[PDB]
């Protein structure tokens, strides 16, 4: 059965080309003694040394190209562009370089916003959050992408399963298992990554006691794992999302769980 | 099951023909036990292994599949002794106490599971009695099948076949024959081998005539089978207990 | 793979006629020791295995799982030629495999360590009592023997089943070595067979065990994500060091 076809991504492709061209082209201000050439090609090439499979690019540089009009697609609509920013970036690496897990972490956001200033309009958007860490937790694997099959019985399907449920694989199978059947869990084909949760709390100097400061969950996914310390202020990359923990889905209880794909000890 | 006939014939032939010069120790052990209404028998393994090596070869192999064929084997004998015709007579419990080789508590780790193990420890506290079942009638919720289930030892689900289902079987408690059970819990002796660590305590189920035989705090030497039960508390992690047949206290102790 | 069988043909050569310190094969003397002690742990130094070839040592940092199963059967073969017996004693000897740096401590661990043997170290915390695990399945019939498992059991009879003692001990990282401003994270440790009871609470212990996950396991309520458990199935046990 042919899948006809796929649609449409529209702007997503425009942002793919813009971001690719941006990570390619300068991205250089300084002249003479630089800080010149490239810096991002040189960033990836410097990255070829340790091959830790992450990149660092500044948001301020990204705003300079289109005058911030490029940064807007990457701001409010950002999570729509996560699968595009990754594979797209790989389309670059495949060209300039010779086992692929890529964690993109933006940084240096124009304005830092407190946990109190957190709104439901800020979802799917980069927001810098400052505050002290409380209750770090031990690092465990995420399923990331999995092969769970067969699933009745020989299929061996490896795809998707990227979203957090984790249920379920084996749906719309094999071709053709028609499972149902067992899930079935296979952990040897499934690459894992990271992660550690930290519960971020507002700094005590800002909060007007009587306050009773309101903590909120930030899970660290990415190589920024372990970079966080208890009793200290940290700046993160926003990706606010939500996690299940109001209407029903008929033929749901949610809360704000902040994500950070980048960490720094600033504060 | 002609094999069970073959085994039980050997047990009868072991009780009726056994001779210590010249009284028959067992056969009279039996009579003198039914008269006082003890309904029990104590086999001395050395006599057993003396008689046939074979039946002890199997009895130390798979005890829990055999020992009840020995029970039925002996009660089929008390039928020909204690009464005569041409009721009711419970199947006697056998208590076997023998020397062998003492296996200390610390040294019980797997590998001998379901093989008779003699050992020695001070009992901590005795658990309050509770009845298991021996013979219970059962009727169906629908077709009303009257089934007399002989439950044996040594958990056992009820049969689902005469919709009907899934498990339409009721226990009739007006006709059901019951026995008793104890649950000793024993801490190994303080002399050996505590070292620097608190001594472990294996949980033991006495039953029928060994029950309330021992005041908690008295040193004893247990015999019994070694076996494991589930008791959800994974994965799988089944926890160890010692069935007792049969208990013998230290000298004297009365 | 079948090719791996040929590897056995090599490692057996490493198992007996390998010599060091002017003659006197060391592993021959270990097999002779148990051997007499019959403690069923054959002990192979990683230093020597790596000294002969780096290709097997690389197999220890890639896929220890099935290779130990390939290896210990051959160890049983070597004991079989040296002592034409032990068909009646234990019929399995799983090899201990001394120090394997690495030497990752505790708190430094990642996904890259999955399925691959890794050394860990730190203080023991109070240990569970010894509860025999199912392992092998056998019955008089009446399907055949079913190995389960480590650790799933999906997807009971019993007649004579070969039980092996299980014990789960929680290993916490040593207090002296903790970097300031950090809590002492800890991992679960699964001992097996003779490794049981070798540990005591309060003591620092050196373990070679491989790292494991399965299977979520159980959260799905408070995480937000498909997060696996972290459990080090243990291999050897040594005092500190």
User: What does the domain layout of chain C look like in residue ranges?
Assistant: 1-102, 103-132+165-241, 133-164
What does the alpha-carbon distance between residue C192 and residue C58 come to, in Å, rounded to a whole number? 25
The CA radius of gyration of chain A, in Å to the nearest whole number, is: 21
Q: Is C164 on the interface with B (CB under 8 A)?
A: yes
The CA radius of gyration of chain B, in Å to the nearest whole number, is: 20
Structure tokens at B236: 């799988």
Q: How many domains does chain B have?
A: 3
What does the alpha-carbon distance between residue C75 and residue C4 come to, in Å, rounded to a whole number? 15
Instruction: Judge contact between C95 and C68, C-beta under 8 A.
Output: yes
CA distances from B172 to A202, B139, B163 (A): 66, 7, 21
Looking at domain A1-111, its CATH superfamily turns out to be mini-chromosome maintenance (MCM) complex, chain A, domain 1 (3.30.1640.10)
Note whether C165 contacts B228, CB cutoff 8 Å.
no
Instruction: Judge contact between B217 and B122, C-beta under 8 A.
Output: yes
Q: Are B23 and B144 part of one and the same domain?
A: no
Note whether C134 contacts B236, CB cutoff 8 Å.
yes
Partners of chain A (3+ Cβ pairs below 8 A): C
CA distances from A56 to A18, A220, B71, B216 (A): 17, 16, 79, 71
Residues of C whose CB is below 8 A from A182: 155
Report the sign of the C-alpha dihedral through residues A215, A219, A223, A226, in that order: positive
Instruction: Judge contact between A225 and A137, C-beta under 8 A.
Output: no
Q: Residue C17 gets which letter from DSSP?
A: S
Note whether C132 contacts B236, CB cutoff 8 Å.
no
Domain with CATH 2.40.50.140 in chain A: 112-142+190-243+255-267
**Looking at domain C1-102, which of 1.10.357.10, 3.40.50.1860, 3.30.200.20, 3.30.1640.10 is its CATH number?**
3.30.1640.10
Name B87's Cβ contacts closer than 8 Å, sequence gap at least 6: none
CA nearest neighbour of B25 among B14, B34, B36, B11: B14
Q: Are B97 and B121 part of one and the same domain?
A: no
User: Inter-axis angle of helices A11-24 and A40-50, to 10 degrees?
Assistant: 80
Q: Are B118 and B168 part of one and the same domain?
A: no
Give the domain extent around B56: 1-101
What does the alpha-carbon distance between residue B190 and residue B192 come to, in Å, rounded to a whole number? 6
Note whether C228 contacts A244, CB cutoff 8 Å.
no
Resolution in A: 3.7
Whether the bond into A31 is cis, omega within 30 of 0 = no
The domain A112-142+190-243+255-267: what is its CATH number?
A: 2.40.50.140
Report the sign of the C-alpha dihedral through residues A119, A124, A126, A130, in that order: positive
φ, ψ for residue C158, nearest 5 deg = 80, 135
- Count CB pairs under 8 A between chains B and C: 38
């Amino acid at each position: 059965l042919n899948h006809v076809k796929k649609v449409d991504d529209v702007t997503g492709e425009k942002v793919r080309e813009a971001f690719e061209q941006f990570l390619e082209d300068f991205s250089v201000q300084s002249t003479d003694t630089g800080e010149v050439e490239k810096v991002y090609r040189a960033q990836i090439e410097f990255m070829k040394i340790y091959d830790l499979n992450t990149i660092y690019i500044d948001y301020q540089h990204l705003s300079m190209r289109e005058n911030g009009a490029l940064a807007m697609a990457i701001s409010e609509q950002y999570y729509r562009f996560l699968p595009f920013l990754q594979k797209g970036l790989r389309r670059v690496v495949r060209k300039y370089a010779p086992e692929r897990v890529f964690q993109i972490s933006f940084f240096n956001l124009p304005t830092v916003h407190r946990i109190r200033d957190i709104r439901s309009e800020k979802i799917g958007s980069l927001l810098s959050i400052s505050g002290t860490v409380t209750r770090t937790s031990e690092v465990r694997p995420e399923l990331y992408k999995a092969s769970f099959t067969c699933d009745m019985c020989r299929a061996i399907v490896d795809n998707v399963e990227q979203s957090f449920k984790y249920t379920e694989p084996t749906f719309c199978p094999n071709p053709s298992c028609e499972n149902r059947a067992f899930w079935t869990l296979n952990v040897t084909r499934s690459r894992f990554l990271d992660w550690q949760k930290v519960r971020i709390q507002e700094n005590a100097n800002e909060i007007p006691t009587g306050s009773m400061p309101r903590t909120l969950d930030v899970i660290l996914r990415g190589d920024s794992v372990e970079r966080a310390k208890p009793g200290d202020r940290c700046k993160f990359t926003g990706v606010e999302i939500v996690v299940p923990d109001k209407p029903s889905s008929t033929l749901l209880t949610y809360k704000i769980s902040f994500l950070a794909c980048h960490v720094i000890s600033i504060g | 099951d002609d094999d069970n006939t073959e085994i039980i014939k050997s047990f009868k032939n072991f009780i009726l023909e056994f001779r210590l010069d010249s009284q028959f120790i067992y056969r009279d052990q039996l009579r003198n036990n039914i008269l006082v209404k003890n309904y029990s028998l104590t086999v001395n393994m050395e006599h057993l292994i003396g008689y046939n090596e074979d039946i002890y070869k199997k009895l130390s192999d798979e005890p829990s599949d055999i020992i009840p064929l020995f029970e039925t084997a002996i009660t089929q004998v008390a039928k020909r002794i204690s009464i005569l015709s041409r009721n009711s007579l419970p199947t006697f419990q056998l208590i076997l106490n023998s020397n062998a080789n003492q296996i200390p508590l610390r040294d019980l780790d797997s590998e001998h599971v379901s093989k008779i193990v003699r050992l020695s420890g001070i009992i901590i506290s005795t658990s309050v009695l509770s009845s298991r079942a021996t013979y219970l009638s059962i009727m169906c919720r629908n077709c009303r099948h009257t089934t007399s289930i002989t439950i044996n030892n040594f958990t056992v689900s009820l049969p689902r076949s005469c919709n009907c289902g899934p498990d339409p079987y009721i226990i009739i408690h007006e006709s059901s024959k019951f026995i008793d059970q104890q649950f000793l819990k024993l801490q190994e002796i303080p002399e050996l081998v505590p070292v620097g660590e608190m001594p472990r305590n294996l949980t033991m189920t006495c039953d029928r005539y060994l029950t309330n035989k021992v005041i908690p705090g008295t040193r004893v030497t247990i015999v019994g089978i070694y076996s494991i039960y589930n008791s959800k508390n994974g994965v799988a992690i089944r926890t160890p207990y010692i069935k007792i047949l049969g208990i013998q206290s230290d000298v004297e102790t009365s | 793979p079948n090719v791996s069988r040929t590897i056995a043909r090599e490692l057996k050569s490493f198992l007996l006629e390998y010599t060091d310190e002017t003659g006197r094969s060391v592993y021959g003397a270990r097999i002779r020791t148990l051997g007499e002690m019959n403690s069923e742990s054959l002990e192979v130094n990683y230093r020597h295995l790596a000294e002969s070839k780096a290709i097997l040592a690389l197999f220890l940092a890639k896929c220890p799982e099935e290779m130990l199963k390939i290896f210990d059967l051959v160890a049983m073969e070597a004991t079989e030629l040296h002592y034409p017996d032990y068909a009646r004693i234990h019929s399995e000897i799983h090899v201990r495999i001394s120090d394997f740096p690495t030497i990752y401590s505790l708190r430094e661990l990642r996904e890259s360590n999955l399925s691959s043997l890794v050394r860990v170290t730190g203080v023991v915390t109070r240990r569970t009592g010894v509860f025999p695990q199912l392992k092998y399945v056998k019955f008089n019939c009446l399907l055949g023997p079913f190995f389960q498992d480590s650790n799933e059991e999906i997807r009971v009879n019993g007649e004579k089943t070969v039980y092996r003692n299980y014990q789960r001990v929680t290993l916490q990282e040593a207090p002296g070595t903790v970097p300031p401003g950090r809590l002492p994270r800890h991992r679960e440790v699964i001992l097996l067979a003779d490794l049981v009871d070798v540990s005591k609470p309060g003591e620092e212990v050196e373990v070679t065990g491989i790292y494991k996950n399965n299977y979520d396991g159980n959260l799905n309520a408070k995480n937000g994500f498909p997060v696996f458990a972290t459990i080090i199935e243990a291999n050897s046990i040594k005092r500190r060091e």
